[PDB]
């Protein structure tokens, strides 16, 4: 698709919430473990994401994710308008490597983003730079 579209979702594992953002054009993933699946967590995460990539529009598979005032506030300020099983597959394979789940998650993001025919990491920067 077009280069400012991201998709946000939460997935659950070991009683914790993993917030997963996928840049739709590239497959590039950013991800964080959060304590609770709250609107404030989504708001802050959206602020972090928009300061790093040019985020125009965000989609989700759970629309109610985006109905908190806090989320709306974040999108308003950052100018935002409205392949997780592979990620869960990589987590499972490296989970023994690490104590904390959050560490396994960032390992899995690293593998995913740098697996190649280019990697999701190389596609996002080419896509965004072409756009400029």
Ligand X SMILES: CC(C)(C)O[C@H](C(=O)O)c1c(-c2ccc3c(c2)CCCO3)nc(-c2cnn(Cc3ccccc3)c2)c2ccccc12
Which of a copy of itself, ligand X, none does residue 69 bind to, with CB < 5 to 8 Å depending on kind?
ligand X
Torsion of CA 114, 120, 124, 130, to 10 degrees: 110
Which of ligand X, a copy of itself, none has residue 73 at its interface (CB below 5 to 8 Å by kind)?
ligand X
- 30: phi then psi, degrees, rounded to nearest 5: -115, 140
Length reported for the chain: 132
Spatial strand order in the sheet of 16-23: 28-34, 16-23, 5-13, 57-60
15 in helix, strand or coil? coil
Which one of residues 35, 51, 63, 117 is an interface residue with a copy of itself (CB under 8 A)? Answer: 51
Q: Which does 76 bind (CB under 5 to 8 A by kind): a copy of itself, ligand X, none?
A: ligand X
Residue numbers of the site for a copy of itself (CB under 8 A)? 30, 44, 47-48, 50-54, 77-78, 102-103, 106-107, 109-110, 113-114, 118, 121-122, 125-126, 128-129, 132
């Amino acid at each position: 698709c077009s280069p400012g579209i991201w998709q946000l979702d939460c997935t659950h594992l070991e009683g914790k919430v993993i917030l997963v953002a996928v840049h739709v054009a590239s497959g590039y993933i950013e991800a964080e473990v959060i304590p609770a699946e709250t609107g404030q967590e989504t708001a802050y995460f959206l602020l972090k994401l928009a300061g790093r990539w040019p985020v125009k529009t965000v989609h989700t598979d759970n629309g109610s994710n985006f109905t908190s005032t806090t989320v709306k506030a974040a999108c308003w300020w950052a100018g935002i308008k409205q392949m997780n099983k592979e990620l869960k597959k990589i987590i499972g394979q490296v989970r023994d490597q690490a104590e904390h789940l959050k560490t396994a998650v960032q390992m899995a993001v690293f593998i995913h983003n740098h697996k190649r025919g280019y990697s999701a990491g190389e596609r996002i920067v080419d896509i965004i730079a072409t756009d400029i």
